[PDB]
Structure formats: structure tokens, C-alpha cells
Design a protein around this ligand. Structure first.
Ligand SMILES: [Cl-]
Length: 246
């Protein structure tokens, strides 16, 4: 069991403080949502946690260790994997090669690079687990969005992450795709991976969150189970609307 502990983030750009004070927690096997009005702080908060935006103030601890000053690849080494909106998998590489490429770069707990046998074994495992074994030889370029998404999870999983940070996974996707993504998050949850999601699609996100934080005016307006969040009068006034229904 791991914990990601975020305390009192602040980010100021010029004369404008976009994140005033945001704190949150994520634990292993927990799905947490970072929601709220556009530009009211949720995104900058998310990126400070990812490591794309340096903190002006605050703390971020992963298993008791500070990581707020570390670059992204260092956070990744420690178990914090980031899955951006756009890409990336190497389009010219096969599905299998995309996964192996990650595994070839890993270092054991021993401190040693994986044996050829170990890489083959883990590749086979990840292909089966993500139900994409039929695509092993396919170039990444040829994949549907849903299949590509699965390859990206596989590449993240190949680093053996403790936490996975999803940047707008539901943006622009059809209702069928929503279900696939929710199934994938549940799969991650059952693997004892903590998941942090920021997204604009309220119902889709809340629908798989154990816990959610509503960010408004650079601060945490409310936090808790989705069921309680919806009924919060402040949240309805600022964000969801008086007549919101799931
Ligand atoms: Cl924001």
C-alpha cells in the first residue's frame, strides 16, 4: 500500500494566483478525481502533481519521500506514471515492440536490467492482461483509439507504477469508449494501483471515482465520495447547477 500526499499547492503566474491552496491524498487501489470549473485551478494543480509545473509553494510526498522538486522521469522511477491526452507510442513500432522498448530500459529491485527471458515473459503477460495479444505484430499507427489506449496502459504498466495520473481520458470519446476506459480504470484499481484523474466530463469521471475534489477559486471547495459531492450546495452553485442529475 502506497500513498501520494499533496499539501497546500500554490502557483502564481505574474500578478495572478491560479492555485491558492490545494491539498489531496491518493492511496493504492483508490480512484480519485480532480474536478471543477475550467481554469479554476484543477488543471494547474494536476500538472504540479505530474511535475510539468513547478510548485511556488507546497509539498508532494510519495511514500513519505518528497518529490515536488523532482523531474518527471525521476517521479516515474519512483512509481508515478503519467498518461497524457495526445500520445505516445511509437507508431513505426509494433504493439509488442512498443512494450518491449519500455521493459528493455527497466532496472530490477536487484539493480539489474531484465534478462531476455524476463522481458519476453512480461511482454506476454501485459499483452494478455490488456487483451491485446491479437495485436502484437500490428504497427501502432494502425490501431483504433481504444486499442491504442490499451497499448499506452501496457507501456505505463511495464514501469511497474504505484500511481497512474490520467489527463482528460474522456475528452472527445464516444459513450462506448467511456465504458472501455472505466473498465480499464477498474482493472488498474484491482491491481492495487492508485489512479488520479482530471477531466471535464463530470458524470463519466465521478462514475468511477472513490473520492473527488472540487477545485474552485484556486482552492478545494469540497472533497468526498461522488454521492456527497453532488449534493453539496456550494458545488451545485458554482459548478454542477441546481438541477444537476447523474
Ligand atoms: Cl486550472
Amino acid at each position: 500500500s502506497s500513498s501520494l500526499v499533496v499539501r497546500n499547492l500554490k502557483k502564481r503566474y505574474g500578478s495572478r494566483t491560479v492555485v491558492k491552496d490545494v491539498s489531496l491524498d491518493v492511496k493504492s487501489g483508490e480512484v480519485v478525481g480532480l474536478l471543477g470549473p475550467n481554469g479554476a485551478g484543477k488543471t494547474t494543480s494536476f500538472y504540479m502533481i505530474v511535475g510539468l509545473v513547478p510548485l511556488d509553494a507546497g509539498e508532494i510526498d510519495l511514500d513519505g519521500k518528497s518529490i515536488s522538486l523532482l523531474p518527471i522521469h525521476k517521479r516515474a522511477s519512483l512509481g508515478l506514471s503519467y498518461l497524457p491526452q495526445e500520445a505516445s507510442v511509437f507508431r513505426k513500432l509494433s504493439v509488442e515492440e512498443n512494450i518491449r522498448a519500455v521493459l528493455e530500459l527497466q532496472v530490477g529491485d536487484d539493480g539489474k536490467r531484465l534478462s531476455k527471458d524476463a522481458i519476453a515473459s512480461r511482454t506476454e503477460a501485459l499483452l494478455d492482461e490488456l487483451q491485446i495479444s491479437h495485436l502484437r505484430e500490428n504497427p501502432a499507427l494502425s490501431l483504433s483509439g481504444g486499442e491504442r489506449r490499451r497499448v499506452e496502459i501496457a507501456r505505463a504498466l511495464a514501469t511497474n507504477p504505484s500511481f497512474i495520473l490520467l489527463d482528460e481520458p474522456f475528452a472527445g470519446v464516444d459513450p462506448i469508449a467511456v465504458l472501455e476506459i472505466q473498465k480499464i480504470v477498474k482493472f488498474l484499481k484491482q491491481r492495487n494501483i492508485g489512479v488520479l484523474i482530471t477531466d471535464h466530463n463530470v458524470r463519466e469521471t465521478l462514475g468511477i471515482c472513490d473520492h473527488a475534489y472540487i477545485i474552485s477559486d484556486g482552492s478545494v471547495l469540497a472533497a468526498g465520495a461522488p454521492g456527497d459531492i453532488i449534493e453539496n450546495e456550494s458545488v451545485r452553485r458554482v459548478y454542477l447547477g441546481e438541477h444537476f442529475r447523474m
